[PDB]
Amino acid sequence: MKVQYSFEREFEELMSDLLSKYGYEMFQMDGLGDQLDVVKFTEDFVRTNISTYFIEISKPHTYLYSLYRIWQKMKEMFGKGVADEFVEAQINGAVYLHDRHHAALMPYCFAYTLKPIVEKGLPFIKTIKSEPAKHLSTFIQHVIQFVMFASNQSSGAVGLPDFFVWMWYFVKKDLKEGIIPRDKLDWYIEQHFQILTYSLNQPIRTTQSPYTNFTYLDRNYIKAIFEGERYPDGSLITDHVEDIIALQKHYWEWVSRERERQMFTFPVLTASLLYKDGKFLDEDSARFINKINMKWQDTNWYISDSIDAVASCCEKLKGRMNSIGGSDLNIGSFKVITVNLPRIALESGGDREKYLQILRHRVQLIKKALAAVREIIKERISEGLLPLYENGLMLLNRQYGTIGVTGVWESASIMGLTTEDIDGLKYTEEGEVFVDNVLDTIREEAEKGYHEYGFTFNIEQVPAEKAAVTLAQKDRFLFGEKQPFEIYSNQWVPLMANTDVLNRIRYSGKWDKKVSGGAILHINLKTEEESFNMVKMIADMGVMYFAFNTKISVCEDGHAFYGERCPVCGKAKVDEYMRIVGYLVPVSAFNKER
Amino acid sequence: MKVQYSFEREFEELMSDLLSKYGYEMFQMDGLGDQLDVVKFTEDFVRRGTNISTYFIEISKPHTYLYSLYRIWQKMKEMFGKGVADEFVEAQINGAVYLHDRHHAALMPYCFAYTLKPIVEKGLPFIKTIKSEPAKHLSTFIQHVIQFVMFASNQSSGAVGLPDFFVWMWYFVKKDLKEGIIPRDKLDWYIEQHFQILTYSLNQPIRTTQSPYTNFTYLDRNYIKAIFEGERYPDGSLITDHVEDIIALQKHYWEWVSRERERQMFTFPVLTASLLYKDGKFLDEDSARFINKINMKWQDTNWYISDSIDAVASCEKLKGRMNSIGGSDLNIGSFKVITVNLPRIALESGGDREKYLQILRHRVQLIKKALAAVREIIKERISEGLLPLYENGLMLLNRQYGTIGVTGVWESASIMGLTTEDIDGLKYTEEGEVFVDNVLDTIREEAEKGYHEYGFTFNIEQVPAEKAAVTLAQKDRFLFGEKQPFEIYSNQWVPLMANTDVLNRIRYSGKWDKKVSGGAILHINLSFKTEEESFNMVKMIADMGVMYFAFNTKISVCEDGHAFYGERCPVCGKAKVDEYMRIVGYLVPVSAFNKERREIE
Ligand SMILES: Nc1ncnc2c1ncn2[C@H]1C[C@H](O)[C@@H](COP(=O)(O)OP(=O)(O)OP(=O)(O)O)O1
Ligand SMILES: Nc1ncnc2c1ncn2[C@H]1C[C@H](O)[C@@H](COP(=O)(O)OP(=O)(O)OP(=O)(O)O)O1
Ligand SMILES: Nc1ccn([C@@H]2O[C@H](COP(=O)(O)OP(=O)(O)OP(=O)(O)O)[C@@H](O)[C@H]2O)c(=O)n1
Ligand SMILES: Nc1ccn([C@@H]2O[C@H](COP(=O)(O)OP(=O)(O)OP(=O)(O)O)[C@@H](O)[C@H]2O)c(=O)n1
Ligand SMILES: [Mg+2]
Ligand SMILES: [Mg+2]
Ligand SMILES: [Zn+2]
Ligand SMILES: [Zn+2]
């Protein structure tokens, strides 16, 4: 049976024109082939439970609408030619539209402050309304309901950096009023840690749990952010730095302790530390994080050289944006659109000058697309469909349009700008300059964007959990043996590359700053003092976001351990946890997705 | 653009035939017209002002219905041949029958009333994102109940029943109190605070588009004793040793609910009190008088009346009350409801009552085959691993009815010319009452045969039909026009808004509730003069044989959701802006019902 989609002839012609050129396998690769056939899709899915079915079924169709809607908007704003060009690039694999099934419907991610939740409660829930919390139990509960609300109003992370700032207030209150058995205060704190953590690891996005971030704010950051800001009882938040610190430390100690019982992913843990002139200003917090990380290495290191971007937080945008974790308070991105660099290399045929003209062009096309998507978001807001915006929780003016990049290594390899020696794989000198030029080119267009389109752009070397595959596929499909790589890399140097770590650190030191920390370095791995030194060295080199990776075994009951046998129940290892794309995940789910 | 779906050409030919015989308008009414066009659907949704999270659930419903329709057609063809398969598809699309939750029909089952026993004894091993050990505290127990409701409510189409909630909650209240986890001087707070955490969670949009549908049951002493006979708590103690404890906690919730509404109104959980009643008296009179008293305020509780506990003792033909609104016995559910359009048969019969009854038996027998097919599809999904509720022994297939729904009884008889009026208002004629006796008995016979026929037990229910009551009258009015003067069909033996003496309503429910085995409801719009007067009236109704009933008040609410009576909020002083009313058996915002009803006119 045939089903009609009321597309403009111009679109249907375009789609037709592309289908004839690229063929069906390309549309199949883009998820617009057999996946649009409900009967085929369903009996295919028949091979996670049924609640997943209803989320997965509509994605090809909502993608196809969003593609169409963005095409329409881009044509309105920049003419048919530009609109057609984006669609072709999206389908052929020149660019990767992220969360494309959502792209013309809701935004991507934002790091929230819980302040307005503490102060207004939950008025934006329409099925029922909640007053502001008066107890630790309710406060925790409000966060849970908020993450449920927010994680289905957006595609990406829900960041909760200042969570522990507000939690302490309700610890003090319930302690004041004698709700806690003081003979068991640590159990009480750790119970609310447990209840929150386990809830955030429930399939609240149906197909999976929400993506959430916690931040250990160091003493310097707590001071800068909440300078002058008061608690609901009128007291000053800054007066309780040490109180807020110990609560944070408590959680990190507890989670390290909890993993043996049950291994979990979320929240993603980052420690934000200020570091100047070869030293941590909050050295106490620094040595603490380094110590807790010794067990699982489950906290990412965020390093910054100033706190100016976060002063008195609570038109050009400043503040670190990172998809994995570490994003500053009240910073996000409404959408990412990535540039396939290996594609540009294959197109350039070696001509670095043509590459940089092709690159500069595609970045500008992306900027136009981001500007179109942003217009759609604003439509959806006015249409009453995005209450996160209307209740002042998600802030559009505080969301970047993000220009993504991936496959940096593979691109330079295709250009023939990599090599190997006693220290392993590396870039040639021309290669490093080429990277400087690529990143400099994109930086130029990002800055021009602000004056061009009225909002701030940023740049990120994205995790590319899926794009790293479907792009190498589309390029393989369109260039064959010329594209030898099975997947593209999400770091300056590939994770599984035989190379001295000192080179990895240097490249990150060179280029992390160019993307404003919009990247991550993590190395697969023996003393505490030895470990802490390594951290300082990496920080000296200028690396802005990094972590160390361990192989965490698990059994079918969820016990965390190292080895082949569980030291809890004796059940053998069955799966592994590892930081593959920035956060700790089961390898089995990762490989099966790929 | 054009999109292909891989149907057997036999099905495609069938759909082709039906379209030519009924026209595109028929498919539009069935939700298989413009609704399947994503661009049309989206731009339509985009200017329907609920937020963007709703879009992704509503978008696929026409498509998933189409698949489910196609899958049932296939299975029905495999079990009973193409004629029966074609006969069913035609009957669904034209409106002879109503497939409930049709967008889920080939994917997941309908409803069930669970016991939290396995949750208590095993925790949450079936959640895949993370695993929880058996609870050890009140806080975790509550939090487990919540994860269970989220789990179950998105793997079924209908109600998540929690009859024995207060039985199990109490044990953890006692555990945390003993071990100094709960401060004694704040014993009542910790209890009402977790009443509040659970209840508010249950009114969160956990099903995205809406909150879950949940039920609570006040089990009276007789029911507690019967159900948990010989059953022990985790500490080893007998549950029947703590009947009084369980009762008191239950009373605390009802007292609390009635206390909590003025602060914030809410629908869920839907409240029912199950009471044993024989020979003109309540066997647990203390519980009955309590419920009678508490209800004086909001009338927010439904009365469930039974005359024996034989059907729930120590909890292959299935017995146990199944009711969609609430009151469903522990470990009872339905895997699917398919309703028969009775006014349709009236229109076909032309008045010939013998002809009517022939058509009815046929369509019931057609419905039974459909239920049997769906049940086979469910079993397929289970084995395919898509329905863990079964694998973990929470949802029980053997304990699930196949349901032959009914609707439009009044309107049907009216068309037959078997209704009238007198000094005490609208009522059935003598032959009309006989006719209704024949209709229900006929269906009942076939249901009973179904067990021997199809291997599982069948039940009957005059369903709420919040939507079906509209779309069927629409289709009938489209196919018969002037012959069908009703805008909607009724979900009670006598229409709620029909001027009739209440005693007539009670009589008819007394007569016919037992035929559907309490598979119905009776609610009367109201003030009483005394508590004792109300209690007498409850006993009168219970004498008459009514099995499920309630009284209705018009609960005002302001913009912040405070519950009150009148035009001014006693809490904030803000004016009334909306009402709450039991329209189909549970309390809802009238503005929500009216518009949801309007979005299908
Ligand atoms: N699970 C939940 N989800 C959302 N809101 C909730 C939940 N539980 C409680 N609430 C709401 C109810 C209240 O409007 C609000 C604050 O409740 P709470 O902090 O317990 O104060 P309260 O109004 O209950 O007074 P108290 O509990 O001190 O008697 O939170
Ligand atoms: N919000 C939640 N959702 C799901 N599971 C949870 C939640 N909070 C805690 N759990 C899990 C964690 C445990 O595996 C299990 C039992 O927790 P609980 O009853 O608090 O005892 P416990 O194992 O934490 O011992 P204790 O609390 O006495 O240290 O429930
Ligand atoms: N289970 C996940 C994984 C990732 N993310 C979000 O997506 C980001 C990384 O996405 P990426 O892997 O780059 O996206 P792809 O999978 O390549 O593409 P798509 O947009 O289709 O997911 C994370 O930082 C996070 O904010 C998420 O919400 N949930
Ligand atoms: N918001 C609601 C309303 C009802 N129900 C379930 O559906 C039953 C009543 O459904 P009914 O009104 O008979 O179905 P319709 O809405 O007419 O048809 P459909 O199956 O298409 O919903 C209730 O008892 C309840 O178990 C539900 O899960 N959620
Ligand atoms: Mg605990
Ligand atoms: Mg409270
Ligand atoms: Zn184990
Ligand atoms: Zn009010």
B204 is known to lie in a ligand binding site: no
- Judge whether B326 and B159 are in contact, CB under 8 Å: yes
| Ligand lying nearest the CA atom of residue A324 | 3
Distance from CA of A504 to the nearest CA of B (A): 33
Q: What is the C-alpha separation between B66 and B36, in angstroms, rounded?
A: 9
First to last CA, chain A: 32
- Judge whether B309 and B276 are in contact, CB under 8 Å: yes
Q: What is the C-alpha separation between A105 and A335, in angstroms, rounded?
A: 11
Closest alpha carbon to B234 in B139, B149, B137? B137
Q: How far is the CA of B136 from the centre of ligand 5 (A)?
A: 7
Q: For B367, list phi and psi in degrees, rounded to 5.
A: -60, -40
Q: DSSP assignment of A106-157, as one string?
A: S--EEE--SHHHHHH-B-S-SSS-BPPP-SHHHHHHHHHHHHHHHHTS-SS-
A250 is known to lie in a ligand binding site: no
Q: What is the C-alpha separation between B416 and B410, in angstroms, rounded?
A: 10
Residue B371 neighbours by CB distance under 10 Å: 23
Q: Kindly report the three-state secondary structure assignment for every residue of A348-415.
A: HCCCHHHHHHHHHHHHHHHHHHHHHHHHHHHHHHHCCCCHHHHCCCCCHHHEEEEEEEECHHHHHHHC
Q: Could you tell me the two tokens for B422?
A: 């007198």
- Kindly determine whether residue A46 and residue B140, on different chains, have CB atoms separated by under 8 Å: no
- Judge whether B328 and B113 are in contact, CB under 8 Å: yes
- Judge whether B577 and B558 are in contact, CB under 8 Å: yes
Q: What is the C-alpha separation between B547 and B529, in angstroms, rounded?
A: 24
Q: How far is the CA of A90 from the centre of ligand 4 (A)?
A: 42
Q: DSSP assignment of B202-237, as one string?
A: TTS-TTSSS---EEEEEE-HHHHHHHTTT-B-TTS-
Q: Residues with Cβ within 6 A of ligand 4?
A: B 100-101, 111, 158-159, 210, 213, 324-325, 463-468
Long-range contacts, A244-248 (Cβ 8 Å, 24+): A244/A164, A244/A165, A244/A168, A244/A217, A245/A219, A245/A285, A247/A164, A247/A167, A247/A168, A247/A171, A247/A189, A248/A164, A248/A216, A248/A217
Q: Could you tell me the two tokens for B93?
A: 């699309």
**Residue B201 with chain A: CB contacts under 8 Å:** 141, 145
Residue A157 neighbours by CB distance under 10 Å: 27
A361 is known to lie in a ligand binding site: no
Q: Which residues surround ligand 7, an ion (CB under 5 A)?
A: A 555, 557, 559, 566, 568-569, 571
Closest alpha carbon to A330 in A347, A343, A318, A344? A318
Q: How far is the CA of B520 from the centre of ligand 5 (A)?
A: 43
Closest alpha carbon to B475 in B584, B338, B341? B341
Q: What is the C-alpha separation between A405 and A411, in angstroms, rounded?
A: 11
Q: Per residue in B189-208, is it b (16+ CB within 10 Å) or e — as a string?
A: ebbbbbbbbbbbbbbbbbbb
Q: Per residue in B441-467, is it b (16+ CB within 10 Å) or e — as a string?
A: ebbbebbeebeeebebbbbbbbbbbbe
Encoded amino acid at B354, one letter = E
- Kindly determine whether residue B204 and residue A128, on different chains, have CB atoms separated by under 8 Å: yes
Candidates A5, A49, A203; nearest CB to B386: A49
Chain B, nearest residue to A123 by Cα: B560
- Kindly determine whether residue A128 and residue B203, on different chains, have CB atoms separated by under 8 Å: yes
Q: What is the DSSP letter of B393?
A: T
Return the ∠ at Cα B35 (arms to B29 and B39), rounded to 5°: 155
Q: What is the C-alpha separation between A429 and B472, in angstroms, rounded?
A: 76
Q: Could you tell me the two tokens for A416?
A: 């023939």
Please name every residue paired with A445 in a beta bridge, in sequence order, or none if there are none.
Answer: none
Residues recorded for chain B: 601
Return the ∠ at Cα A165 (arms to A161 and A166), rounded to 5°: 105
E-only strand ranges, B520-577 = 522-525, 548-552, 555-557, 563-564
- Kindly determine whether residue A202 and residue B127, on different chains, have CB atoms separated by under 8 Å: yes
Greatest CA separation found in chain B?
74
- Judge whether B248 and B187 are in contact, CB under 8 Å: no
B189 is known to lie in a ligand binding site: yes
Helix axes A467-479, A341-348, angle to 10 degrees: 20
Chain A with chain B: Cβ pairs closer than 8 A: 197
Q: Could you tell me the two tokens for A379?
A: 């439509």
Closest alpha carbon to B105 in B370, B439, B359? B370
Give residues with Cβ within 8 angstroms of A233, minimum separation 6.
A169
Q: Residue A546's Cα: distance from chain center in Å? A: 14
A463 lines ligand 3 (CB under 6 A): yes
| Ligand lying nearest the CA atom of residue B137 | 2
Q: Could you tell me the two tokens for B264?
A: 């914030």
Q: What is the C-alpha separation between B112 and B118, in angstroms, rounded?
A: 15
Q: Which helix (H) or strand (E) holds B506?
A: helix B502-512
A462 lines ligand 3 (CB under 6 A): yes
- Judge whether A383 and B47 are in contact, CB under 8 Å: yes
Q: What is the C-alpha separation between A362 and A460, in angstroms, rounded?
A: 16
- Judge whether A400 and A458 are in contact, CB under 8 Å: yes
Breaks (C-N over 2.5 A) in chain B follow: 49, 315, 526
Helix axes B468-480, B342-349, angle to 10 degrees: 20
Q: Could you tell me the two tokens for B61?
A: 């419903």
- Judge whether B437 and B514 are in contact, CB under 8 Å: no
Cα–Cα separations (whole angstroms), residue B465 to B102, B340, B407, B476: 13, 11, 7, 16
β-strands A299-304, B270-276 pairing:
unpaired
Candidates A47, A262, A386; nearest CB to B131: A262
B50 is known to lie in a ligand binding site: no
β-strands A575-579, A552-554 pairing:
antiparallel
Q: Which helix (H) or strand (E) holds A420?
A: strand A418-421
**Rg of chain B, C-alpha, whole Å:** 24
Please name every residue paired with B273 in a beta bridge, in sequence order, or none if there are none.
Answer: B218, B303
Distance from CA of B402 to the nearest CA of A (A): 21
Residue A176 neighbours by CB distance under 10 Å: 10
Q: DSSP assignment of B120-145, as one string?
A: HHH-B-S-SS--BPPP-SHHHHHHHH
**Rg of chain A, C-alpha, whole Å:** 24
Q: What is the C-alpha separation between A145 and B153, in angstroms, rounded?
A: 17
B143 is known to lie in a ligand binding site: yes
> Among B102, B126, B386, B387, which would you mutate to test the A interface (most chain A Cβ atoms within 10 Å of its Cβ)?
B386
Q: How far is the CA of B16 from the centre of ligand 3 (A)?
A: 43
β-strands A575-579, A418-421 pairing:
unpaired
Helix axes A528-541, A501-511, angle to 10 degrees: 40
Candidates B4, B155, B183; nearest CB to A49: B155
β-strands A575-579, A584-586 pairing:
antiparallel
Q: How far is the CA of A302 from the centre of ligand 3 (A)?
A: 20
Q: Residue A80's Cα: distance from chain center in Å? A: 32
Closest alpha carbon to A548 in A510, A516, A509, A504? A504
Chain B, nearest residue to A264 by Cα: B130
Q: Could you tell me the two tokens for A190?
A: 């750790």
- Judge whether A402 and A457 are in contact, CB under 8 Å: yes
Residue keyed to tokens 């604003």: A378
Distance from CA of B384 to the nearest CA of A (A): 7
β-strands B563-564, B555-557 pairing:
antiparallel
Q: What is the C-alpha separation between B407 and B491, in angstroms, rounded?
A: 6
Per DSSP, the three-state class of B33 is: coil
Q: Which helix (H) or strand (E) holds B112?
A: strand B111-113
Q: What is the C-alpha separation between B83 and B519, in angstroms, rounded?
A: 31
Per DSSP, the three-state class of B565 is: coil
Per DSSP, the three-state class of A592 is: helix
- Kindly determine whether residue A191 and residue B139, on different chains, have CB atoms separated by under 8 Å: yes
Q: Could you tell me the two tokens for B4?
A: 């292909």
Q: For B268, list phi and psi in degrees, rounded to 5.
A: -105, 155
Candidates A40, A68, A181; nearest CB to B181: A181
Chain A, nearest residue to B589 by Cα: A127
Closest alpha carbon to B109 in B309, B380, B293? B380
Q: What is the C-alpha separation between A492 and A508, in angstroms, rounded?
A: 7
Return the ∠ at Cα B355 (arms to B349 and B361), rounded to 5°: 110
Q: Which helix (H) or strand (E) holds A584?
A: strand A584-586
Q: How far is the CA of B504 from the centre of ligand 4 (A)?
A: 27
Cα–Cα separations (whole angstroms), residue B136 to A283, B141, B180: 39, 7, 13
Residue keyed to tokens 């139990």: A137
Residue having the nearest C-alpha atom to atom 21 of ligand 1: A134
A225 lines ligand 3 (CB under 6 A): no
A551 is known to lie in a ligand binding site: no
Residue keyed to tokens 């489209």: B478
Please name every residue paired with B302 in a beta bridge, in sequence order, or none if there are none.
Answer: B272
Residue keyed to tokens 């009114």: B203
Chain A, nearest residue to B205 by Cα: A127
Q: Kindly report the three-state secondary structure assignment for every residue of B238-261.
A: EHHHHHHHHHHHHHHHHHHHHHHC
- Judge whether A231 and A237 are in contact, CB under 8 Å: yes
Q: DSSP assignment of A5-25, as one string?
A: ----HHHHHHHHHHHHHH-HH
Per DSSP, the three-state class of A497 is: coil
Q: Residues with Cβ within 6 A of ligand 2?
A: A 187, 191, 194-195, 198-199, 262; B 123-124, 132-133, 135-137, 140, 143, 147
- In B47-115, where does DSSP find H-type helix? 52-58, 61-80, 82-94
Torsion B44-B50-B55-B60 (CA) sign? negative
Q: Which helix (H) or strand (E) holds B460?
A: strand B458-462
Encoded amino acid at B505, one letter = R
β-strands A279-280, A399-406 pairing:
unpaired
- Deposited experimental method: X-ray
Q: What is the C-alpha separation between A376 and A103, in angstroms, rounded?
A: 9
Using most ligand atoms within 8 A of CB, pick from B29, B50, B324 the residue to mutate for ligand 4.
B324
Candidates B131, B204, B208; nearest CB to A125: B204
